[PDB]
């Protein structure tokens, strides 16, 4: 669903500088008249391209699925997943690609050239034969330009791979070759798999510099996608970009994860969704936001109410290309706790909704010496300690001064949240237009114990993930399913 | 321009207009509405298509049964809008017989599956109704109802000019405000521009030009106004309709004449911009006409013009009169250069405009210059360039498109406060997706904003927003992201 192919994905001023040998403006112009298509994932790795008057246009069948031919709605919806579509440059030209996977049907990845709906081509297919550590590819891949001079599919190896290892896979966009496999150690002898990565570009040039990804073990890993040496003044320079830089890619912090997520009792919390990054308020480093949860196995269809899943905000203070041979080892104790303190039914204007209010505890980042005090925050997905097995499996959206996320609670029910990325708590401004006003105003606020407060969470209709768009008027909106909510990124 | 998708308004702006209604429920219901595009066909004929150019609907006015560039304008372009009547919100479509006959019609296009005929108006209903080339405006009035406000059109029975206020629900002529121009000279009121000066969604004034070049203003408020809240809705009701009248005691705000003293027809609707002093408004209007066959030919004998006239009595004042003005009281602006250049990798032929300041007041508040003007000509070369399309004023810029028969389209982004070059880049001529220095031009070894650029003549001016929430002006064939100003 979120995989629609209409206009060019980027703005020319951003894409063109990435590829001097190409012409994005002419590519963009061409796509202005491209026949829109929406590709949806099915049971296995099956792809059914069709939309706008829902006319079946295309259908793809993986070699693994084509040869084989020789629970619940919320859960099935997740399992079927959705392919990733993006614009990429290779073969000397811009293309619109679609990256899919065999889902739970098998261990495989595939990419299609979807630039011309009337002429979809198969770029490549990856299986265990090509990548021995490839597992069930539930992770959502990212398509990006890397410092090795080329575009690649960057994703986690997935789950239940042959040796239960976790690794970042960097697949050449054009060839499907494994440009680099960045294995992570983590805890051994215990099943692991790397999840959806979030690429970081810290000098706004369209070339990915770092990648962040959690794993089934709850480790939040960072990977350096830049050369060993540096240029110090501008460590993210493209000057030495080339195929050789690929060998320099490495797990960051000497192989130590930025963080290892465990619940209140100390039990590991799997991370499925991609992290989100927000520049730290001091402008030094970034706050890495990630939530825990897992939903790929049948057993996961049922709520695990033995522990709470959690949303974390961890300070990565070494994001300026420093060697970063290591990183602080943190625990919830080094973070500021936030809580979901109230769930209630209320009416905003005329619209009735069930909402949740979060705490608003400040985070004390530095002591007067300048040394680090709290390194972040956390929020257990539970209202006043009641465990319902609420978890995060969908990617989040960080914009302005807010982080938007959607959680799922297997019964499943969906809760959309708008939180302060700097604290993990309630924003000081109202985020959602819950009153269907067309704008974000006080009509959407809630009276929490004599206090007019911003609503941090609201329950929304059947699963649909979260998408950020702009309603005709320049106003940003966040949509899930059935409802889109005008949002306020902050003053 | 006549596309019917989601609700036209943001709820917080529409709801206050009709407390007895629920725009929220209306808007929600349209979120799922099947998008339709309505194209005004051969004068009268109206065809509806789906997002995928598919014959979905077609309307043939009783008039019909009663039995390249020039054709684009003469053909049509219906007006769609959300209006309130019958105690509910509806999406209406106002059509005109155009060159076919003399009449207007309104359709209820709220439900693409069940379109209804609201009403049809002809000379039988409105004797002074002429060929309906003027573009109507759907608006809420102080008489308590929504109405179709438009110019009576051209070559009407007695060639008179009048503002027509047509009840939205009934199609009845609520008021006909006749205007007195020059004797024996054929006249007709053109597309009006309604003004809402206290931003509550209820029109207060209407401005419209006529074939004689007069720019008229009409008071759409009660005669007995409360100086503390002249635009108040407290006394709204049918009793207010009788007080609607021609402003300034029957005198036009301005009478447009070319540099040689000849009258300049006004066909396009004016555009309003609050005066920098916050007192009054700058009434911007362009000159030209293209509804008659002879108009297909370029008139190279004179230069058409764009004017910015200061109306200093826009706060409910009785305004029994208005200053008699001429080019002499206005600051001139000129198009000093036209050249072909390349912005980024996109080739474009552009024009540079002067940037002469406007001196509005004396130390004691006395009025010096009452506006500005710009003759559509480069270095005095007359090509017959004229404005026949509505303009778009947003932020600190007025966007307009002129047509040069022979036809060639020129899109301009000018400073509304002076009619000259903006001090900032307006158009993204480099196809960067954003407006940056790549779109500026070196004028006399100085970076300066480009005020005009030639378009692939075939469309009009439409303002929209890109996926990134930024202003974008499209000209059928190409959209240019724009910068409304700092
Ligand atoms: Ca970079
Ligand atoms: Ca008003």
From Swiss-Prot, chain A:
Transmembrane segments: none annotated. Keywords: Calcium, Cytoplasm, Fimbrium, Fimbrium biogenesis, Membrane, Metal-binding, Signal. Its main location: other. It comes from the Bacteria. GO terms for molecular function: calcium ion binding. GO terms for cellular component: cytosol; membrane; pilus. The keyword S-adenosyl-L-methionine does not apply. One of its GO terms (biological process) is type IV pilus-dependent motility. The keyword Signal applies. Ca(2+) 2 binds at residues 201, 203, 205, 207, 209. It is found in: Fimbrium; Membrane; Cytoplasm, Cytosol. Disruption phenotype: Pilus assembly severely impaired. Retraction-deficient. Prevents incorporation of PilE into pili. Belongs to the PilY1 family. Interacts (via C-terminus) with host integrins alpha-V/beta-3 (ITGAV/ITGB3) and alpha-V/beta-5 (ITGAV/ITGB5). Residues 598-606 comprise a calcium-binding site which together with the other one (residues 849-857) seems important for interaction with integrins of the host. Involved in pilus assembly, twitching motility and adhesion to host cells. Primes type IV pili (T4P) assembly and is required for inclusion of minor pilins PilV, PilW and PilX to the surface pili. Stabilizes assembled pilus fibers likely by antagonizing retraction mediated by PilT. Calcium-binding and calcium release by PilY1 seem to be essential for twitching motility and for regulation of pilus retraction dynamics of PilT. This is Type IV pilus biogenesis factor PilY1. It comes from Pseudomonas aeruginosa (strain ATCC 15692 / DSM 22644 / CIP 104116 / JCM 14847 / LMG 12228 / 1C / PRS 101 / PAO1).
UniProtKB/Swiss-Prot annotation, chain B:
Ca(2+) 2 binds at residues 196, 198, 200, 202, 204. It is found in: Fimbrium; Membrane; Cytoplasm, Cytosol. Disruption phenotype: Pilus assembly severely impaired. Retraction-deficient. Prevents incorporation of PilE into pili. It comes from the Bacteria. Involved in pilus assembly, twitching motility and adhesion to host cells. Primes type IV pili (T4P) assembly and is required for inclusion of minor pilins PilV, PilW and PilX to the surface pili. Stabilizes assembled pilus fibers likely by antagonizing retraction mediated by PilT. Calcium-binding and calcium release by PilY1 seem to be essential for twitching motility and for regulation of pilus retraction dynamics of PilT. Interacts (via C-terminus) with host integrins alpha-V/beta-3 (ITGAV/ITGB3) and alpha-V/beta-5 (ITGAV/ITGB5). Belongs to the PilY1 family. Residues 598-606 comprise a calcium-binding site which together with the other one (residues 849-857) seems important for interaction with integrins of the host. This is Type IV pilus biogenesis factor PilY1.
């Amino acid at each position: 669903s979120p995989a629609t192919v209409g206009k060019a994905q980027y703005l020319t001023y951003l894409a063109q500088p990435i590829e001097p040998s190409g012409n994005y403006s002419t590519f963009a112009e061409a796509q202005k008249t491209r026949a829109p298509r929406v590709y949806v994932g099915a049971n296995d790795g099956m792809l059914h391209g069709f939309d706008t008057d829902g006319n079946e246009t295309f259908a793809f069948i993986p070699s693994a699925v084509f040869e084989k031919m020789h629970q619940g709605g919320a859960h099935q919806f997740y399992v079927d997943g959705s392919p990733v579509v993006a614009d990429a440059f290779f073969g000397g030209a811009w293309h619109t690609v679609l990256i899919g996977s065999l889902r739970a049907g098998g261990k495989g990845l595939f990419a299609l050239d979807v630039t011309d709906p009337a002429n979809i081509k198969l770029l490549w297919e990856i299986g265990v034969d090509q990548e021995p550590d490839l597992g069930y590819s539930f992770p959502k891949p990212t398509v990006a330009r890397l410092h090795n001079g080329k575009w690649a599919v960057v994703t986690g190896n997935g789950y239940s791979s042959m040796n239960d290892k976790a690794a970042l896979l960097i697949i050449d966009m054009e060839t499907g070759a494994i440009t680099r496999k960045l294995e992570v150690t983590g805890r051994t002898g215990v099943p692991n798999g790397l999840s959806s990565p979030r690429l970081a570009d810290n000098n706004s040039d369209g070339v990915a510099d770092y990648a962040y990804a959690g794993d089934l073990q709850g480790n939040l890993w960072r990977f350096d996608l830049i050369a060993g040496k540096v240029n110090q003044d501008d460590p993210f320079s493209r000057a030495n970009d080339g195929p050789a830089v690929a060998s320099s890619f490495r797990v960051s912090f000497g192989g130590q994860p930025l963080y290892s997520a465990v619940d209140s009792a100390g039990a590991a919390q799997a991370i499925t969704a991609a992290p989100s990054l927000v520049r730290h308020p001091t402008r030094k480093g970034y706050i890495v936001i990630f939530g825990t949860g897992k939903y790929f196995e049948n057993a996961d269809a049922r709520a695990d109410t033995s522990r709470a899943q959690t949303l974390y905000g961890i300070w990565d203070q070494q994001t300026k290309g420093e060697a970063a041979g290591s990183t602080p080892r943190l625990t919830r104790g080094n973070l500021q706790q936030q809580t979901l303190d109230l769930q209630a039914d209320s009416t905003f204007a005329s619209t009735a909704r069930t909402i949740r209010i979060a705490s608003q505890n400040p985070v004390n980042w530095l002591n007067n010496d300048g040394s680090t005090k709290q390194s972040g925050w956390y929020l257990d997905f539970m209202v006043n300690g009641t465990l319902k097995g609420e978890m995060l499996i969908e990617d989040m959206i960080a914009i302005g001064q807010v982080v938007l996320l959607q959680t799922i609670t297997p019964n499943a029910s969906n809760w959309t949240y708008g939180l302060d990325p700097y604290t993990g708590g309630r924003t000081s401004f109202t985020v959602f237009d819950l009153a269907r006003q067309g704008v974000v105003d006080s009509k959407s606020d809630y009276s929490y114990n004599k206090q007019n407060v911003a609503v941090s969470g609201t329950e929304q209709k059947g699963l649909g993930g979260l998408t950020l768009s702009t309603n005709e008027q320049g106003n940003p909106e966040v949509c899930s399913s059935g409802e889109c909510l005008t949002v306020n990124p902050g003053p």
